[PDB]
Amino acid sequence: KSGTWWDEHLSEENVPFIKQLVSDEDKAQLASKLCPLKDEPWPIHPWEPGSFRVGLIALKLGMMPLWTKDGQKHVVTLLQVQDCHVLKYTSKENCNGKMATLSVGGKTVSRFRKATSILEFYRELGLPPKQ
Amino acid sequence: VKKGFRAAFRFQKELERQRLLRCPPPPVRRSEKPNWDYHAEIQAFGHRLQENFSLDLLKTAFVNSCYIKSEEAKRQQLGIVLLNLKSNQELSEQGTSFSQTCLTQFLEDEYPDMPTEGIKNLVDFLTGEEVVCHVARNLAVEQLTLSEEFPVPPAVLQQTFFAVIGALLQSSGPERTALFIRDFLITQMTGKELFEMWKIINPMGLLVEELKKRNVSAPESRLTRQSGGTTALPLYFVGLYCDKKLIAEGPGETVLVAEEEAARVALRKLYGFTENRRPWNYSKPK
Amino acid sequence: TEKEFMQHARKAGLVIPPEKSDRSIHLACTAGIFDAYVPPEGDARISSLSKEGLIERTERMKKTMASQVSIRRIKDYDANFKIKDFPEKAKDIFIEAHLCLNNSDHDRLHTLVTEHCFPDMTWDIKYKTVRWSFVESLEPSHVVQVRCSSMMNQGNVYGQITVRMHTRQTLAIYDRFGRLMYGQEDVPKDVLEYVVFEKQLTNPYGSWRMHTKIVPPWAPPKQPILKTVMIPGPQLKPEEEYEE
Amino acid sequence: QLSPTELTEMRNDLFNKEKARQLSLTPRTEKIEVKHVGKTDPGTVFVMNKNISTPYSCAMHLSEWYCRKSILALVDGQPWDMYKPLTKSCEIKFLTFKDCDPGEVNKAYWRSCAMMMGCVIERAFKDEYMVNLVRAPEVPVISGAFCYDVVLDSKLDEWMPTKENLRSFTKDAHALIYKDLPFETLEVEAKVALEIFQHSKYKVDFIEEKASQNPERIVKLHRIGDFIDVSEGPLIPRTSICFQYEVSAVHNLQPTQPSLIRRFQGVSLPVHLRAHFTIWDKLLERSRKMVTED
Amino acid sequence: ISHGRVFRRMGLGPESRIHLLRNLLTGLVRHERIEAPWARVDEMRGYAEKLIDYGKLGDTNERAMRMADFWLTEKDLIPKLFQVLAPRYKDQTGGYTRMLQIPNRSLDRAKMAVIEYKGNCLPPLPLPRRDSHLTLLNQLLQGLRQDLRQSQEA
Amino acid sequence: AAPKNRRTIEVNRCRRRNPQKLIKVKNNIDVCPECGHLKQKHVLCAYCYEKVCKETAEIRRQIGKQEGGPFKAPTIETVVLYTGETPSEQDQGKRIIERDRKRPSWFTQN
Amino acid sequence: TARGTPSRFLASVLHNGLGRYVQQLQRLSFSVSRDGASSRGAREFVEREVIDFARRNPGVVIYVNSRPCCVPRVVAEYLNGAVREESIHCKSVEEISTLVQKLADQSGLDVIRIRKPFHTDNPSIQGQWHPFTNKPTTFRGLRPREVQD
Amino acid sequence: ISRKWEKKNKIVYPPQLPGEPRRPAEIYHCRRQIKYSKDKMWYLAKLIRGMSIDQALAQLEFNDKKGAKIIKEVLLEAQDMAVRDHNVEFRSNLYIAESTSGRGQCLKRIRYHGRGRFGIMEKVYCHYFVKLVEGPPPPPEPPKTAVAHAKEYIQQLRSRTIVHTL
Ligand SMILES: [Mg+2]
Ligand SMILES: [Mg+2]
Ligand SMILES: [Mg+2]
Numbered sequence A: 001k002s003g004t005w006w007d008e009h010l011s012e013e014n015v016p017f018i019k020q021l022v023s024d025e026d027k028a029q030l031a032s033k034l035c036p037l038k039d040e041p042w043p044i045h046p047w048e049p050g051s052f053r054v055g056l057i058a059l060k061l062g063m064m065p066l067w068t069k070d071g072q073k074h075v076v077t078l079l080q081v082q083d084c085h086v087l088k089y090t091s092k093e094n095c096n097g098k099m100a101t102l103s104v105g106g107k108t109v110s111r112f113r114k115a116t117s118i119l120e121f122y123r124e125l126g127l128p129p130k131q
Numbered sequence B: 001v002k003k004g005f006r007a008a009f010r011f012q013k014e015l016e017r018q019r020l021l022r023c024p025p026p027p028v029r030r031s032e033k034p035n036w037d038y039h040a041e042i043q044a045f046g047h048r049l050q051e052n053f054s055l056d057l058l059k060t061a062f063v064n065s066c067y068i069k070s071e072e073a074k075r076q077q078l079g080i081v082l083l084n085l086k087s088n089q090e091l092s093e094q095g096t097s098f099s100q101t102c103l104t105q106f107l108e109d110e111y112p113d114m115p116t117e118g119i120k121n122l123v124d125f126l127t128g129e130e131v132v133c134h135v136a137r138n139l140a141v142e143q144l145t146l147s148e149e150f151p152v153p154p155a156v157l158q159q160t161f162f163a164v165i166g167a168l169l170q171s172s173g174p175e176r177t178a179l180f181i182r183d184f185l186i187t188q189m190t191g192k193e194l195f196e197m198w199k200i201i202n203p204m205g206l207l208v209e210e211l212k213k214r215n216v217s218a219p220e221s222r223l224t225r226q227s228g229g230t231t232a233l234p235l236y237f238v239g240l241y242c243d244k245k246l247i248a249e250g251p252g253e254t255v256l257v258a259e260e261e262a263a264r265v266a267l268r269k270l271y272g273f274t275e276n277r278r279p280w281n282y283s284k285p286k
Numbered sequence C: 001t002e003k004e005f006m007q008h009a010r011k012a013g014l015v016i017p018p019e020k021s022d023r024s025i026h027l028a029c030t031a032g033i034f035d036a037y038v039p040p041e042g043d044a045r046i047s048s049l050s051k052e053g054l055i056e057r058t059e060r061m062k063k064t065m066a067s068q069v070s071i072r073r074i075k076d077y078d079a080n081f082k083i084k085d086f087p088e089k090a091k092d093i094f095i096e097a098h099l100c101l102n103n104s105d106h107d108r109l110h111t112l113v114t115e116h117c118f119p120d121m122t123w124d125i126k127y128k129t130v131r132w133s134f135v136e137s138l139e140p141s142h143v144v145q146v147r148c149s150s151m152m153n154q155g156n157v158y159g160q161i162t163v164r165m166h167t168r169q170t171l172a173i174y175d176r177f178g179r180l181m182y183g184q185e186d187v188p189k190d191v192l193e194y195v196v197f198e199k200q201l202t203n204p205y206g207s208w209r210m211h212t213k214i215v216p217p218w219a220p221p222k223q224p225i226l227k228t229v230m231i232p233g234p235q236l237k238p239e240e241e242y243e244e
Numbered sequence D: 001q002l003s004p005t006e007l008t009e010m011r012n013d014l015f016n017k018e019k020a021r022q023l024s025l026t027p028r029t030e031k032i033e034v035k036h037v038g039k040t041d042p043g044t045v046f047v048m049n050k051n052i053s054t055p056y057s058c059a060m061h062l063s064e065w066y067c068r069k070s071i072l073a074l075v076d077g078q079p080w081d082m083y084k085p086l087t088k089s090c091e092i093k094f095l096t097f098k099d100c101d102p103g104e105v106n107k108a109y110w111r112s113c114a115m116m117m118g119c120v121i122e123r124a125f126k127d128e129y130m131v132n133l134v135r136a137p138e139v140p141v142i143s144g145a146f147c148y149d150v151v152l153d154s155k156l157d158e159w160m161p162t163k164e165n166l167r168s169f170t171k172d173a174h175a176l177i178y179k180d181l182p183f184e185t186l187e188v189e190a191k192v193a194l195e196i197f198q199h200s201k202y203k204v205d206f207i208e209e210k211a212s213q214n215p216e217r218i219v220k221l222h223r224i225g226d227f228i229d230v231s232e233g234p235l236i237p238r239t240s241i242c243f244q245y246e247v248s249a250v251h252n253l254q255p256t257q258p259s260l261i262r263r264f265q266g267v268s269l270p271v272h273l274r275a276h277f278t279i280w281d282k283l284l285e286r287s288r289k290m291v292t293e294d
Numbered sequence E: 001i002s003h004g005r006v007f008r009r010m011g012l013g014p015e016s017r018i019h020l021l022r023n024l025l026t027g028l029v030r031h032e033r034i035e036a037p038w039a040r041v042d043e044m045r046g047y048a049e050k051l052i053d054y055g056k057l058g059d060t061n062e063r064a065m066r067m068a069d070f071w072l073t074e075k076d077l078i079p080k081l082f083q084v085l086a087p088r089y090k091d092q093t094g095g096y097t098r099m100l101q102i103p104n105r106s107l108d109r110a111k112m113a114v115i116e117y118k119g120n121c122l123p124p125l126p127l128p129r130r131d132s133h134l135t136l137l138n139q140l141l142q143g144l145r146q147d148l149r150q151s152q153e154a
Numbered sequence F: 001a002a003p004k005n006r007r008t009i010e011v012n013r014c015r016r017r018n019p020q021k022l023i024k025v026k027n028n029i030d031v032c033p034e035c036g037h038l039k040q041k042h043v044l045c046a047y048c049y050e051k052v053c054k055e056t057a058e059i060r061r062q063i064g065k066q067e068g069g070p071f072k073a074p075t076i077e078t079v080v081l082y083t084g085e086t087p088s089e090q091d092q093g094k095r096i097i098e099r100d101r102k103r104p105s106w107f108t109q110n
Numbered sequence G: 001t002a003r004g005t006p007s008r009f010l011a012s013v014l015h016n017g018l019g020r021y022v023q024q025l026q027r028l029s030f031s032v033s034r035d036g037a038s039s040r041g042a043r044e045f046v047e048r049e050v051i052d053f054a055r056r057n058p059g060v061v062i063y064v065n066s067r068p069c070c071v072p073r074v075v076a077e078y079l080n081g082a083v084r085e086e087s088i089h090c091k092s093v094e095e096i097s098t099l100v101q102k103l104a105d106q107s108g109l110d111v112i113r114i115r116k117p118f119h120t121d122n123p124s125i126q127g128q129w130h131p132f133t134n135k136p137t138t139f140r141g142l143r144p145r146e147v148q149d
Numbered sequence H: 001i002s003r004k005w006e007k008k009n010k011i012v013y014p015p016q017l018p019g020e021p022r023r024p025a026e027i028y029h030c031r032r033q034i035k036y037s038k039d040k041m042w043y044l045a046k047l048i049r050g051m052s053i054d055q056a057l058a059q060l061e062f063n064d065k066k067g068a069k070i071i072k073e074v075l076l077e078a079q080d081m082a083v084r085d086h087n088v089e090f091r092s093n094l095y096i097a098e099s100t101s102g103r104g105q106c107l108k109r110i111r112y113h114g115r116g117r118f119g120i121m122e123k124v125y126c127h128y129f130v131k132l133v134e135g136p137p138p139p140p141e142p143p144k145t146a147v148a149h150a151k152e153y154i155q156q157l158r159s160r161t162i163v164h165t166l
């Protein structure tokens, strides 16, 4: 009736192995999705007026000045997009809304700090969990 | 310390009542309680029921086998004259046999369409351990019963009650005793349905057999009324049709339950045990 | 707001009453047996050998000069006293003394047992129900030994009679909640115990009452209890390590 | 021939008959002084009853923590079942999953899960098929999976369980866990053990081997409710001990032509050693691969 | 708003905060193991880790001598720091002190902790130990590792 | 500000007996593998830590009798020695502390 | 209360009067005092009235226990087992005579609120109302705006 | 004052019939005049109410409240009293049946305020009562499920009659 964590019962010899083992699996899954147009992509429709495309999930790094040819100092924010993937698609009929909803994740995190329901969702998708 | 006695005395009675509530005393026989005269209480028994009971027969009707055996054991310890008391086993059989044969006469005459299997159950119900004891406890039968254990067990109480009928049977005859069964046993099935006393299994199966005896084609079950079929609170009225003629309509929460109840409705109409039947005639015989 | 608790009680000694008092505590029974009796080893075998037992009981009384003299002292304070009726009279006292435990009739028990015997019998069964019965008697009782106290030890003379009994008994002791705890109410078992009686000869109202039981070192182990027992080892503080 | 639904009826009657017979042979009450030898509470002495008291009963005298954690009992240097009555006064020690060298504990748990896996096999298959258990291979703990060889009917010669078939075993395995049926151990003679398992061909051979090794010719019997099986070595006290339970796959042993022997593999872990979901799925992959004892 | 604040507010002020930590640090140098409230131990742990670094600079360093002179109220411990503690951790680069939690004191039920320098001559604390490799869970992962190593070499 | 009305016991029970006010049960309790007494998973065992302090206090009392005053901290290492022991090969040039007691089992000599 | 007291439905004992009428009163216990003005009305009731009252009701057993007491009482026991105890302390002969007759008429049931002034075991003879009683049936029993085949 | 809790250990039941089931042991123990608030003591008694004898000691050992150590001493001597005098076989086979606190006699002192004002402050004392019953603690009541709610709601719709009519 007491809670437990992933490395409570692991010995000194197993903890480095477990950390390295799951780390290698994350690298393989991220490197196995870098070919989307070969693994049976969905049809690519041409651009039409009144169409909305999906966005990204970026990480705010900081700020950096930027100068234009007009000589005006404009400050910009560095947004780093890392481990950004599409999770699932919901059609307009299933959305109960005017537009179709698309799920996006980012910033791959540890698999030991997520609930069972979330982990099994990514197990079939073959991607590490997103924050 | 306030002087006086009436207030202190009155408060003690209130405290004793609370004592009887927190720790109620176990029940005891009314005979052991004061202001009891067995000879007087049994004479009023006949007048209360308006019957010419015989005291010699009536006194032996409440004497049980267990009471006699326990009575002998008490004298053995003290070494103490012989007792010639008779048990009510002989009287109980006379009352029991007569009651079943008298109820059979009443039921088969009032309900000529009721099958013999059904007649047995109603006699087994009116003379049952539950119906007899409820009638027995409200006629000062338990108080006058001489038993070994208090309260009187229902099995012992049932046997003692029929002994009273047996005592009444010899003193008054069958004609006078037949009214006693009508006024105390027949009146126990008034607000009760046929299958509420005659518990059966698969009424639909029994309905088919009763229609075969009367050369009636197999009934066809069809839906007459329907409401909330897709909801959790449905209502189905399944109608039984013989040769495209409606014979019974029954409600129910589901189709099988409604069909089962519709079968019971048909059986009640066939046996003549409907709610619309005329009430039992308790008037004086002509 | 200056009111305080009435805490003023201090612990005093109950060992001795206030001194320099004319009144003194009057005692009816002695603390222990004046001369301890050790039954000979192998008496259990002699229990079966009734014929050898009868001869030994008569011989021991005659061969023990001291035991024969103490009988004379008893007959001085009570002329109407016989040694051939006491073993039968002891059974009546012994049976009646153990029947008061079931009904908790402590008023009559003090007339059957002494003030020394009462705490041992009743303290352990204060909140327990005891079902004891006397089924059958195997061997008649015999006057093993009679010894009297020294003359005018405290102004009174005490006389003790050692009696041997070998009878079957039934014991059924239930706990406070009615659960069976020790013994069996159905099957009796043989009991071999030596009963010592005592009486204050000086007191005119005195009488023979049960005093104690002799427990020989060669006695068989008693009947085991129903439940299990855990015996903890010595509790140890952290600074103290375990020593066997 | 006796139906499988009634086959276990006679086994329980024989099992209870001998279990009550051993109680009758023991006297009414005999006291045995059990001493505790351990780092915790040294010197404690238990006055227990012979053939009635169990190491679990001794654990209740100390504390409830002992009862929860004492997976196995170490009596006189030999493993002892928690619900096995003690026969003589002797020193006692309790073993847990989390110890310096829980070698016997892991083996006792590993064999226990093998018996639980066999129990659900006798029920999932239809009554028309003859499912005969063979034995419980003593696979090492480091192998990563516990197996229970099973022989099926000739009709199911090429039928292979699917993903959904295996999930049914896991759900039924958890049902046995939810019932919390205690492990009842009973050591009987070889001749008595043959009577219970006479209708089973493979069990008779297994009982024969055990009788030859032990000079006393005694055979240990363990049961979980109605299911009765023959196993070697002490087992865990209750089925609730194992938290995660899953069967990986089924492999057919060779040669197959003379006889078809299927190997039901699976992996399990107790409540005391619960593993994370991510780590657990890694163990599932290993258990799927066929493992062979040395 | 306290964002990025790494230093705690203790004592009667910033100056009193240094003196309270200085007394704890000085008592830690002399006894090599002290017990104190958890927050003060954790705050002082950073200074104890960096105190050895100044001790590795040598006693001839003027800057290192002043830090030892300031942080050590008792002047007899300064020779000990440059001749015992600093040589002891010559091979190590950090993590000279270990901090563990202990049962709260009965006086005020305050969260307590014990801090000691590694390698001391005092009896070892009952340090927390992970489950042995011979446990059931470790053996299953050990078996998986062996096959993975064998598969990789294939 | 003073209360306008007296709050009833029914209102008070809902506040005093609210689950937030009630004590929370702890799930981080386990038995110490060494002595068997209870301990928390993140806190050192009280019984085990107590016997270390009792021995540590005895050792520090011996050190005080050797220095014989304050401001006399040695510039060399320290070694704790018990009955039946001699200085080791690596324990050379250090300050030895002699203890008139057997070495504890949990105290591992290094 | 009505809310502060229990209640019961109108009923009788074993359907009294359905086939025959049975006097539910079973026993009367009078405790009069030889000396004491409190029993002056009760003593006159015993001397002339209880004798004729016993003539009218043979099924009721009457006990007259003469003992010293400050409050004379009458205890009535009924067949159903309920016991009603009443005090006749300092009451006239007529008031006692009316009170005793009232006890004879009662059935013994508790004198509490009765929910309904009527009680019938077969309230319906033509069929209890159900929502489909007054709704006509349609061809093939089709539902509204429902097409078949 | 009232001391009925102590007398509850002196009631002796009649011996049980062979067919009667095992009656669990009942142990009543208490400590009087504890320098603690009955309001604060209630949270400690409520915490261990329904827990096992060993589980309750685990909660009270690591609890920071002062009364936690006071209650633990009461349980330890009550656990010993159960085996020693009440014929309880296993000391760990106990659970807390009744655990409550009662007000004790409190002294009255004066707390001085400003402007020559004063306020009477009491030195609160409290009692602690504990009842031990042999046997495992009863399983906690499962939360009421949707099926039970659906069963109850339908049962309500079946017990309704036509009111204010025949
Ligand atoms: Mg502050
Ligand atoms: Mg002031
Ligand atoms: Mg002033």
Ligand SMILES: [Zn+2]
Binding pocket: F032, F033, F034, F035, F036, F037, F039, F045, F046, F047, F048
């Ligand atoms: Zn410890």
